[PDB]
Structure formats: structure tokens, C-alpha cells
Design an enzyme around this catalytic site. Sequence first.
Site, PDB file in Angstrom:
ATOM      1  N   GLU A  35      -0.424 -13.309  11.536  1.00  0.00           N
ATOM      2  CA  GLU A  35      -0.628 -12.740  10.183  1.00  0.00           C
ATOM      3  C   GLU A  35      -2.037 -12.143  10.105  1.00  0.00           C
ATOM      4  O   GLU A  35      -2.203 -11.083   9.517  1.00  0.00           O
ATOM      5  CB  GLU A  35      -0.420 -13.824   9.154  1.00  0.00           C
ATOM      6  CG  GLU A  35       1.022 -14.259   8.932  1.00  0.00           C
ATOM      7  CD  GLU A  35       1.931 -13.174   8.351  1.00  0.00           C
ATOM      8  OE1 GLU A  35       1.438 -12.129   7.918  1.00  0.00           O
ATOM      9  OE2 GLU A  35       3.160 -13.379   8.345  1.00  0.00           O
ATOM     10  N   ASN A  46       0.683  -3.518   0.891  1.00  0.00           N
ATOM     11  CA  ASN A  46       2.098  -3.278   1.158  1.00  0.00           C
ATOM     12  C   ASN A  46       2.499  -1.933   0.509  1.00  0.00           C
ATOM     13  O   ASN A  46       1.834  -1.422  -0.434  1.00  0.00           O
ATOM     14  CB  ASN A  46       2.887  -4.447   0.591  1.00  0.00           C
ATOM     15  CG  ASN A  46       2.443  -5.767   1.164  1.00  0.00           C
ATOM     16  OD1 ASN A  46       2.189  -6.718   0.456  1.00  0.00           O
ATOM     17  ND2 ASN A  46       2.400  -5.849   2.453  1.00  0.00           N
ATOM     18  N   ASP A  48       4.713  -1.252  -1.625  1.00  0.00           N
ATOM     19  CA  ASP A  48       5.018  -1.380  -3.070  1.00  0.00           C
ATOM     20  C   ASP A  48       3.721  -1.522  -3.874  1.00  0.00           C
ATOM     21  O   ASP A  48       3.801  -1.709  -5.048  1.00  0.00           O
ATOM     22  CB  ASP A  48       6.052  -2.496  -3.197  1.00  0.00           C
ATOM     23  CG  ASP A  48       5.476  -3.901  -3.130  1.00  0.00           C
ATOM     24  OD1 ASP A  48       4.362  -4.021  -2.728  1.00  0.00           O
ATOM     25  OD2 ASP A  48       6.185  -4.869  -3.461  1.00  0.00           O
ATOM     26  N   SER A  50       1.564  -4.049  -3.746  1.00  0.00           N
ATOM     27  CA  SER A  50       1.076  -5.433  -3.601  1.00  0.00           C
ATOM     28  C   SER A  50       0.173  -5.502  -2.353  1.00  0.00           C
ATOM     29  O   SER A  50       0.180  -4.573  -1.577  1.00  0.00           O
ATOM     30  CB  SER A  50       2.206  -6.429  -3.507  1.00  0.00           C
ATOM     31  OG  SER A  50       3.001  -6.214  -2.386  1.00  0.00           O
ATOM     32  N   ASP A  52      -1.460  -8.416   0.681  1.00  0.00           N
ATOM     33  CA  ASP A  52      -1.422  -9.725   1.331  1.00  0.00           C
ATOM     34  C   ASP A  52      -2.853 -10.173   1.682  1.00  0.00           C
ATOM     35  O   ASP A  52      -3.659  -9.367   2.096  1.00  0.00           O
ATOM     36  CB  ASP A  52      -0.602  -9.668   2.587  1.00  0.00           C
ATOM     37  CG  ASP A  52       0.828  -9.297   2.471  1.00  0.00           C
ATOM     38  OD1 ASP A  52       1.353  -9.424   1.361  1.00  0.00           O
ATOM     39  OD2 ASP A  52       1.457  -9.159   3.535  1.00  0.00           O
ATOM     40  N   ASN A  59       1.075 -12.905  -0.512  1.00  0.00           N
ATOM     41  CA  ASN A  59       1.395 -11.641  -1.233  1.00  0.00           C
ATOM     42  C   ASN A  59       1.175 -11.773  -2.759  1.00  0.00           C
ATOM     43  O   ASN A  59       1.754 -12.637  -3.380  1.00  0.00           O
ATOM     44  CB  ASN A  59       2.841 -11.286  -0.930  1.00  0.00           C
ATOM     45  CG  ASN A  59       3.225  -9.863  -1.273  1.00  0.00           C
ATOM     46  OD1 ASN A  59       3.077  -9.415  -2.412  1.00  0.00           O
ATOM     47  ND2 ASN A  59       3.693  -9.135  -0.277  1.00  0.00           N
ATOM     48  N   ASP A 101       9.618 -23.146  -1.395  1.00  0.00           N
ATOM     49  CA  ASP A 101      10.284 -22.256  -2.375  1.00  0.00           C
ATOM     50  C   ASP A 101      11.767 -22.090  -2.015  1.00  0.00           C
ATOM     51  O   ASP A 101      12.505 -21.468  -2.843  1.00  0.00           O
ATOM     52  CB  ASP A 101       9.491 -20.949  -2.426  1.00  0.00           C
ATOM     53  CG  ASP A 101      10.033 -19.830  -3.299  1.00  0.00           C
ATOM     54  OD1 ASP A 101      10.249 -20.060  -4.521  1.00  0.00           O
ATOM     55  OD2 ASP A 101      10.170 -18.700  -2.740  1.00  0.00           O
TER      56      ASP A 101
END
Length: 129
Positions: A35, A46, A48, A50, A52, A59, A101
Site C-alpha cells: 500500500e 483516487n 472519484d 477521494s 487514500d 480511503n 466491516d
Amino acid sequence: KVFGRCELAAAMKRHGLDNYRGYSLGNWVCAAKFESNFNTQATNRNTDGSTDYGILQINSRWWCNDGRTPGSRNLCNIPCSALLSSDITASVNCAKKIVSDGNGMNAWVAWRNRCKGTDVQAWIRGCRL
Ligand SMILES: [Cl-]
Ligand code: NA
């Protein structure tokens, strides 16, 4: 801060990630390598809009607030900036929420593609844990 392999392994163990939600320490170290290359100040935008953040590339779409992800959520209740600290604490506490989650470590695409099913013990070899 750019961690060494065994130095992040030691810090992740000290911070309670070894076997969290059943994921051995090597899984977390592998995920961080791919990562962030062990860089706590890693950021990636990203498609969209967003971003990270940090050693585990958490994110802003869902997990943290950066004030520039229209209509995201902040489910770790932290400014995304908290995830760039040299102290891995906020990233670990948020990673513990993410991995709970429902999808486990599949939330980290680099984990699923590069670490999942591999010899993840290799990531803690030669480390004093
Ligand atoms: Cl799981
Ligand atoms: Na957000």
C-alpha cells in the site's frame, strides 16, 4: 516516516495488530509494504476524488474526513491527516475498524492481490517481535 520491515512489524505488534480479526502480523506488514512502501506520509488520489492516506492507504470515501470528498463518510471519526503521523496509532485503530466491516483484509486491494494466500510469515522473518 519510512519504516524498515522489522521496525513496522515491531510497531504493529506493539499496537495490537498481531492476529487481530485472525490476521497474523505478516498479513499487516505485507499490506503496508504494498500500500505505502512503509511510508506513513503516503497519499494517493483516487479517480472519484477521494484520497487514500498513510501506511495502510485508508480511503476518505468512507473512513476519514479530508474536507474535499463531497458526500463521503468519516467512520473512524478522524481527520485524514491523523493517518499520516509517524506514530502508527490512528492508522491501526482505523485499520481495526475496517477489517471488522465484513470483508476482512479484502478491503485492501494490494493485500488481496499481493499478500492473500502467500507465505506472509516471510514478512516478519529475522525480526525481534
Ligand atoms: Cl475475515
Ligand atoms: Na470522508
